[PDB]
Symmetry: D2
Subunit: 252 residues, 4 copies
Amino acid sequence: ALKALILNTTLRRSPSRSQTQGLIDKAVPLYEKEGIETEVVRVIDHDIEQEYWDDYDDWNAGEKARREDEWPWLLEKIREADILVIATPITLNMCTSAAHVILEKLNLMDELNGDTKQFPLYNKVAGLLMCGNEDGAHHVAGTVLNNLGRLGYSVPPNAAAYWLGPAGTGPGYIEGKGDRHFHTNKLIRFMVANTSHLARMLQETPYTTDLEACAQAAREESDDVFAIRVNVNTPAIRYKRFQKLGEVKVEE
Amino acid sequence: ALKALILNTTLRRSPSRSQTQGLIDKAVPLYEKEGIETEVVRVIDHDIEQEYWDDYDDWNAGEKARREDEWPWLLEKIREADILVIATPITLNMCTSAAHVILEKLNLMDELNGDTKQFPLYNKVAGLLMCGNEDGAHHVAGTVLNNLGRLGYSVPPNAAAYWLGPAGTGPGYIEGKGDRHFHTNKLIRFMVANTSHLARMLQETPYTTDLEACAQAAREESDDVFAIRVNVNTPAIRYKRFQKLGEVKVEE
Amino acid sequence: ALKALILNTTLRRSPSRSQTQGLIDKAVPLYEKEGIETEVVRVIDHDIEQEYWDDYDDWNAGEKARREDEWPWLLEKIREADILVIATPITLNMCTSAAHVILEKLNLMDELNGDTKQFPLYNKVAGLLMCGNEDGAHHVAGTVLNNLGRLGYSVPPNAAAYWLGPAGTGPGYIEGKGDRHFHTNKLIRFMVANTSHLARMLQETPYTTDLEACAQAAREESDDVFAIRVNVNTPAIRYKRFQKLGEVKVEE
Amino acid sequence: ALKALILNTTLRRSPSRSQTQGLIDKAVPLYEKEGIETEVVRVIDHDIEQEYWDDYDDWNAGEKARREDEWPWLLEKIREADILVIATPITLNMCTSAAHVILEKLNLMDELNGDTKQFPLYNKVAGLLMCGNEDGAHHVAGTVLNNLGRLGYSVPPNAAAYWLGPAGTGPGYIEGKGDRHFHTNKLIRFMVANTSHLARMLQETPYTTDLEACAQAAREESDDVFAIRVNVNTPAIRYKRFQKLGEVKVEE
Ligand SMILES: Cc1cc2nc3c(=O)[nH]c(=O)[nH]c3[n+](CC(=O)[C@@H](O)[C@@H](O)COP(=O)(O)O)c2cc1N
Ligand SMILES: Cc1cc2nc3c(=O)[nH]c(=O)[nH]c3[n+](CC(=O)[C@@H](O)[C@@H](O)COP(=O)(O)O)c2cc1N
Ligand SMILES: Cc1cc2nc3c(=O)[nH]c(=O)[nH]c3[n+](CC(=O)[C@@H](O)[C@@H](O)COP(=O)(O)O)c2cc1N
Ligand SMILES: Cc1cc2nc3c(=O)[nH]c(=O)[nH]c3[n+](CC(=O)[C@@H](O)[C@@H](O)COP(=O)(O)O)c2cc1N
């Protein structure tokens, strides 16, 4: 069967009560009625290393970045899930820092599958559940769904469901009675119905795009050097699409 | 046959040379090789009224807003196109004001159909071409594609292609030789292949979601009043998800 | 004698009731108690041409762009005001298209003050009023206030005041009783008090920065060509800060 | 003697070479030439706990969030610094998750200066250094500087300096020769000059705003309950500022 993986990216460790979890609790039985098996992971409960290392970095400095953690376990669940729902509180008009770490680490998956010539997360479907006290839902949805789009996820219409109160400091979903908020409840239902349909579609008729071939055709029509002259004689920062400075020619 | 409509939202009237049109000129033959009938509209060439009126406004003040313009023609083309590609320059880290006016008027389309019980632009596909001198493509992509998804568009992976120069004032795509810019050329090819595929899928197996039925289910599990107490005794704007202010008792 | 100019960027013509105008009506008497002269302009009531032309465009295509409108009148007012307050409704998680046009045209300035070597809007102060039915205030503040900062405006703390209802379709400020909304009313008071203080400060102690001399220091430490090699052999879009492609050597 | 604190929020531990540190290395001598004592902290080098606990959470599970870490050490520096410069690489069109955590924890302060009745970070100045491979500088600047403004920071004009390559995957500042990039080098000079000036101003003539008095005046003109009726009989998500549903009357 198809699988939906819902990542609660709250910053409070289980079992502390999460506002965002209220939206998850509505979505789970709806996915199960669709025949889509659900799993909820609260990512902050798990040891996921934030630090970065590759071979350009200092070798000893990277020991902590290279340590054994729980990321392979979580990455494998994401690879296996046909639907990825990020369920995030809003902080600083963004997703939480926990969602941010996960997405940073996930952005290793724009390289290739040997037989599809597609990124590893191609043919999957993304949805979004968000909870804020007042503001930021559409901004976060734009940022997060755009990034997932870059990785291979398809986004159906009305794929982001959320709760917000009025302009103010709070309170959140629980005291604000968001479990009976009509607009949120109808958005959650839209999102589940549409992500489920698109997931079944992509299971039957995946993209056949060969990104390697697209890239080769693009190589055969492009240069391998970008170069432009800069006007260094002005403090101005106003935009000029035509600057008439002269084109550049490259050494040998 | 499938139709793709590409809206160049440059602020300069034809035949003035448009940087963004360079990306369009790459995309059109690629769609035509996909078997998809393409049409390019430069919306600024057409008389589209920006002012708003509805029957809550003053009747005389709204006369200019109600005047006969070319919006019904353009709206009918959007309704007919299976793929909508917004092709916009970046201004102020946003789409152009012309794209903005078009999207404002298009967001009247969030009500139902017959028959399908879906918004009128359901089962369509969105992609994005963008051109800026230096910065803003992913921010604009998040904003524009999120809004199109609210209307019923589905978004495939890698649906946004763009050109940008380095940090600076420009110049633009033409002087910058973007027509031979590898990254842009490959993204344009990704976008055309993926949008064409998703359009063919949705032609054959559209969403069957009944938004009316989703809304009726939400109504049964929801209140028809939102009400919270407010802490009027503090200058603080720190978020507080629990405030223990007491419930609001509502009459009738 | 300081002047504050408040631009209501609603899309509905006077005298139609504007939701955003409710916040302006709170702010005006507060500024006047500060001893600051205030003027409110509803910009949609004035003829401001959106289209663009310069010498690189087609002459005949640009005739409409070059026509007589009310922009010189409005631009002179912005230039003269010590405090600019954009008072914008939210559309599509952005300011309105009317605000978008004004800012597009305001960004077309290409001057440097001969005596101070600064942009024309240096030493002015920016505040923000916003009104939306549910969502978008901090995103719009980020975008608009970042753009004004690039032009020369300084931004005090708590410079953006706004009203929003809960997640939903509305209603707006008037039916939602925003005029008695504590959070909005206290933010408006913070905004007026802080912008007023900062405006007075800059009137006594303006920036003495010499933008021309900064740019000349930068010219001495910088190249006049930007050039990089591009990896044209991969479909990957993964970010690689080091790519081992070789330096490009330019011939001048 | 003013203090400037520069937080490098790279995800790579010292002494691994950071692209963003290149911009920092330009700014530090410019600040010291202004007579400002400058400290650089690479926050990822320090053990700062990401998890959240307060007394509404689960005591037992909150033990890790409550643990002794290095946050008080870093917060003291932020409390003392007259200028805070966030120096962040761009990930996912945002600041890094490391910057995200720091700002999250900074936003948890709940204090009012007993004498000035201002938030604790009032009268400070914020600036920004950013480094990305291609895109996101103005979006990050909007988000980060809007958040610091809510905390009490003032933002001068041209307070955000950055480097970006063209559309693509990289490379970054070092291989792209950003240390000799004219646009970046001049923006760094603008930013140091303007933040230094504004910090000196605010040390002389701080804001005298009484936030508590402002909130008390807002309390007198406002309701202590927010309540609106909802239309539960539509699937539409079209925005409607006027819905004629009727007022909510609240008991007692
Ligand atoms: C540091 C910080 C920043 C915030 N930025 C925003 C914002 O910018 N906008 C908003 O509307 N709300 C914001 N909130 C409230 C919020 O979202 C959470 O409390 C709630 O949702 C809890 O969910 P959870 O119980 O599942 O963890 C923030 C709270 C923070 N601690
Ligand atoms: C007022 C204003 C603002 C801008 N804001 C940004 C921005 O924030 N970022 C960027 O990278 N570029 C920006 N540009 C350059 C740009 O985009 C166009 O010139 C080009 O693309 C034209 O394309 P076209 O020939 O098809 O019209 C702006 C230019 C403006 N006139
Ligand atoms: C097309 C369109 C899009 C919108 N996008 C958003 C959004 O993204 N978020 C929101 O919260 N609200 C939004 N609204 C409501 C809104 O803002 C205005 O009606 C109000 O403010 C009127 O103010 P006024 O009477 O002074 O003109 C939109 C309304 C639109 N017509
Ligand atoms: C996961 C991920 C995401 C990214 N998202 C973006 C983006 O959205 N836009 C951009 O322009 N660049 C991006 N980069 C490159 C970047 O910024 C850094 O490598 C550089 O700056 C290193 O700086 P440092 O050596 O001081 O750490 C990303 C890189 C990542 N590892």
